[PDB]
């Protein structure tokens, strides 16, 4: 405590007055939370065109990738909300569509590079060209080199899509992208989703891929095994009319 | 090149980083020491680290040389003393910052704390 006095007094008087002034602050009414709680609970009528934003279905609702038409429909309400009475430039929808396409392509490319190998070669018309490609194993690289050498002699010919037999064989095995790959790829980095926490949280909090189907597959603890794991090889009363009411409601919902 | 042959020849590519440092940082990152993990793998990881550091150093030297022969150091890289001795090249903070900004790092600081 004795050294506390010296430490305090080492400061200049002006700084001490500045610090002491804090006592006049009007505490923390946090009245700014009022608007948040309310949200969570001659002349032009600018409020009749903003409400049109919800008429158009979302991409997930319909299943159609957004295009120029949907983006054009969505543009105006945002402009009216922000106070841009004039509107938007004629050629903005195409720009927005191109930007969205580029963003999605970049994200999907980021996810694929960290979980796939033995991609199509760079002989011509296929592969990734000047972009970032996947890794190559020893055996596949050897076979690809041999086939590329052979094709120059005319012994072998490409398939319909321009893939040599080895490349088509390799591409045959690969299956569709799943959620385990996405989860693994999200451990390495952000994959461009640094600004969408909801998507990442939805990925993390979901069921593990392939768990609902195999809901009753178990192992056992057994130290005798190499790894300690032993793999096994009133009217209309509800209590009586509930079924009929449920059936009619199910038919109604369809 | 092949992974098997490279691993076998790893005896001739041992980096300059001691074994104690490799064990310490491998254990910090979650990998047991060499007695349980092939020494070749530890040597390979240390070699990769050495290559990365060497590339950073080369870029820093390249940045430093051009500056040698308006004429005011960029703000945000406070560091240094009197200015060294003789006409020797000195690893200052500006070259390191400019070099590592290519790798995604940021080493900005303050000069006069007031």
């Amino acid at each position: 405590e004795r050294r506390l006095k010296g430490e305090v007094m080492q400061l200049p008087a002006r700084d001490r007055r500045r610090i002491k002034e804090l006592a006049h602050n009007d505490f923390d009414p946090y009245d700014a939370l009022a608007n948040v709680l309310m949200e969570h609970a001659l002349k032009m009528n600018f409020d009749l065109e903003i409400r049109k934003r919800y008429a158009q279905p979302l991409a997930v609702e319909s299943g159609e990738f957004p295009d120029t038409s949907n983006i054009e429909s969505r543009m105006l309400p945002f402009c009216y909300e922000a106070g841009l009475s004039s509107g938007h430039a004629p050629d903005a929808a195409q720009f927005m569509s191109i930007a969205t396409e580029t963003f999605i392509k970049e994200v999907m490319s980021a996810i694929f590079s960290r979980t796939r190998s033995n991609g199509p070669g760079d002989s011509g018309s296929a592969g990734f060209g000047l972009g970032s490609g996947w890794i190559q194993t020893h055996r596949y690289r050897k076979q690809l080199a041999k086939e590329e050498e052979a094709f120059q002699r005319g012994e072998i010919s490409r398939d319909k899509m321009g893939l040599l037999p080895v490349e088509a064989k390799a591409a045959s095995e690969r299956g569709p992208l799943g959620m385990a790959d996405v989860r693994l790829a999200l451990e390495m980095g952000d994959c461009g989703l640094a600004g969408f926490p909801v998507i990442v949280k939805s990925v993390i909090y979901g069921w593990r891929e392939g768990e609902l189907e195999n809901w009753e597959d178990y192992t056992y603890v057994d130290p005798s095994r190499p790894d300690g794991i032993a793999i096994p090889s009133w009217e209309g009363a509800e209590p009586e009319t509930s079924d009929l009411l449920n059936a009619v409601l199910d038919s109604c919902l369809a | 090149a092949s992974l098997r042959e490279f691993l076998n020849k790893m005896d001739d590519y041992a980096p300059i980083i001691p074994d104690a440092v490799t064990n310490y940082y491998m254990t910090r990152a979650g990998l047991p020491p060499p007695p349980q993990t092939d020494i070749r793998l530890a040597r390979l990881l240390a070699l990769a680290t050495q290559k990365f550091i060497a590339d950073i150093a080369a870029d820093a030297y390249q940045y430093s040389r051009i500056r040698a022969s308006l004429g005011i150091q960029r703000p945000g890289y406070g560091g240094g003393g009197q200015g060294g001795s003789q006409n020797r090249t000195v690893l200052t903070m500006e070259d390191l910052g400019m070099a590592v900004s290519e790798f995604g790092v940021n080493v900005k600081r303050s000069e006069f704390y007031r």
Partner: protein, 62 residues
């Protein structure tokens, strides 16, 4: 200036520090929920005619 009083006041002032924000901190949720809620609220506003009609009233005993 009484040194003990000044230091006690300074420490008391610092102990109660509580900085305030400049802009509110955002809260995130899926778009689908917001869109569905907006549509439902608009439909209810239309049906109830701005709250001037109570479509939830009950007459009798069923």
């Amino acid at each position: 200036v009484d040194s003990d009083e000044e230091t006690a006041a300074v420490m008391s002032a610092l102990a109660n520090w509580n900085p305030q924000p400049v802009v509110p901190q955002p809260v995130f949720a899926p778009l689908k929920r917001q869109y569905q809620l907006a549509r439902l609220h608009e439909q209810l506003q239309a049906a109830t005619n701005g709250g001037r009609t109570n479509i939830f009233k009950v007459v009798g005993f069923g």
